[PDB]
Ligand SMILES: CC(=O)N[C@@H]1[C@@H](O[C@@H]2O[C@@H](C)[C@@H](O)[C@@H](O)[C@@H]2O)[C@H](O[C@@H]2O[C@H](CO)[C@H](O)[C@H](O)[C@H]2O[C@@H]2O[C@@H](C)[C@@H](O)[C@@H](O)[C@@H]2O)[C@@H](CO)O[C@@H]1O
């Protein structure tokens with residue numbers, strides 16, 4: 259008596275990263291035994307429960323909204339955060355941070371834009387947020403932006419950050435930032451993170467996570483532009499709507515090639531919202547552009563996959 | 567024997583504009599007898615045929631990709647366009663312009679970003695494209711950007727424009743640009759546009775188009791930031807996947823309020839991909855946040871709606 263579970267038929271290249279507002283490019287698998295995989299965007303159960311900081315909009319990911327105050331002697335502005343909906347922010351909500359908050363330590367560059375309500379005058383400037391910085395305290399309601407202006411932004415007017423890409427600067431050596439698997443301290447460095455979506459790992463020998471991979475635009479320096487998500491944003495939207503009950507811990511998916519009619523590989527979609535495959539080693543999957551995922555049956559954590 | 571037609575259950579505020587990569591905010595209706603409504607993004611038939619310049623990604627809308635050449639004595643760069651997938655562009659495809667090309671005359675501001683293949687060095691700069699300019703010839707494979715640099719960008723390296731908002735500048739007076747209902751000349755001023763998605767209008771007395779409305783960020787001046795689309799991007803994605811056959815020219819939708827169980831209004835979803843309502847005058851609809859569209863039955867162009 260359970261509504262039948264499905265995944266979208268969109269191809270990988272027809273879908274969006276759930277951790278940054280950019281298209282998916284490829285599937286990637288690699289070992290992750292040595293570190294914790296705990297992203298907070300792109301987290302959703304197969305039955306449609308959003309986790310972490312996950313929200314439904316592809317374009318709100320890594321955005322911030324609020325009003326800003328200038329820091330004297332600098333081009334820096336403090337943003338006092340509003341809700342996604344431009345209402346007052348509530349720090350007591352049982353989430354790690356405001357929905358859509360970046361879930362990695364990095365220097366994210368974009369534009370900060372503003373409109374003056376009274377006359378409809380507008381302004382925009384290049385801006386960067388360092389999510390590893392001491393002033394990055396989104397859970398407490400404020401973050402800081404480095405901008406290209408010292409005087410243009412007004413106080414007490416709605417202000418939006420739209421993310422574009424990432425930078426590597428200052429101290430750092432090539433491709434050592436951003437660090438996609440390092441969570442920000444949402445309340446600052448001395449305060450532990452709360453209400454997190456859990457870390458994920460394969461629990462089977464010879465298995466690895468399967469990642470949905472994009473390349474973030476780079477805006478300066480020699481950044482690591484790889485970005486891996488656990489679920490496409492479209493999948494998040496799909497599960498949220500469908501809300502099909504998980505009949506077992508694991509949904510078995512087959513990846514199908516329509517140009518031949520054959521299955522390329524099979525994988526496990528865990529009910530808590532992540533995918534694993536049977537492979538050892540780093541591998542960029544090579545897939546046909548029209549390839550798609552198809553739900554075939556419910557199995558369990560003990561099911562042995564065919565090697566990828 | 568037709569697969570049953572449906573629309574997504576996502577609420578308006580949970581969906582994305584199909585003409586710019588920003589969230590939907592509201593529903594709007596107004597008269598449009600006096601001018602032609604012929605957007606090229608967010609065009610899809612109910613049975614899943616993409617029209618105009620429409621593509622499936624919410625985040626590729628109003629993007630450009632290619633490589634750039636500097637124009638001496640300026641901060642201007644010519645971009646020789648690539649395909650969405652970074653392959654050579656084909657001008658002979660039976661489309662108006664490259665998929666995702668802006669479908670309005672305006673000054674769109676964002677960031678232009680670039681990566682050097684050999685060493686992974688990167689750069690990004692604020693940039694604007696004037697879609698009403700003589701050099702805006704995307705169908706012919708090139709457009710021009712005004713940037714904040716005269717020497718940083720390299721030749722023959724992959725370069726991306728990510729849109730953020732719009733500006734009003736130069737000569738123009740308040741809120742007279744952008745002009746969302748004026749199509750660019752995709753091949754330049756002397757060449758007529760081709761392969762367009764058709765203009766839309768209500769064909770019934772006392773009917774108006776229903777628009778899915780957002781406010782574009784403004785980056786300078788006093789722009790008109792209203793942006794109206796005919797279909798949410800999620801709807802485009804949905805119809806594309808479902809491909810449910812249109813049993814009649816018109817699908818009757820009811821907009822439902824779950825907080826009361828009552829229908830707020832009814833509307834016509836035309837099979838060619840647009841919505842009409844029975845109302846006269848400009849009106850910002852007031853809707854509950856959890857309100858949703860529900861397909862109830864197939865009717866026709868002659869069906870008389872209940873007044874909104
Ligand atoms: C946005 C900006 O102006 N950034 C500069 C940065 O240039 C950016 O990054 C470099 C790698 C290159 O892609 C530029 O096109 C881009 O604008 C500067 O980087 C130095 O840039 C020169 C070229 O102008 C050389 O490429 C040099 O190798 C770069 O230096 C090293 O990389 C930097 C990112 C720093 O880590 C620096 O300590 C390194 O020696 C830097 C350097 O002043 O300054 C801005 O960030």
Ligand SMILES: CC(=O)N[C@@H]1[C@@H](O[C@@H]2O[C@@H](C)[C@@H](O)[C@@H](O)[C@@H]2O)[C@H](O[C@@H]2O[C@H](CO)[C@H](O)[C@H](O)[C@H]2O[C@@H]2O[C@@H](C)[C@@H](O)[C@@H](O)[C@@H]2O)[C@@H](CO)O[C@@H]1O
Nearest residue numbers: 374379380381382410411734735736737738785786787788
């Ligand atoms: C990005 C930038 O520097 N743009 C300026 C522009 O300022 C932008 O737009 C104005 C409306 C305001 O929102 C600024 O905060 C924003 O940076 C300049 O606009 C003049 O700006 C001053 C404030 O610095 C006044 O607001 C003035 O009314 C503005 O002028 C008129 O509006 C302009 C957009 C032009 O149409 C001008 O002819 C008008 O008289 C302009 C003016 O030099 O210059 C850049 O575009």
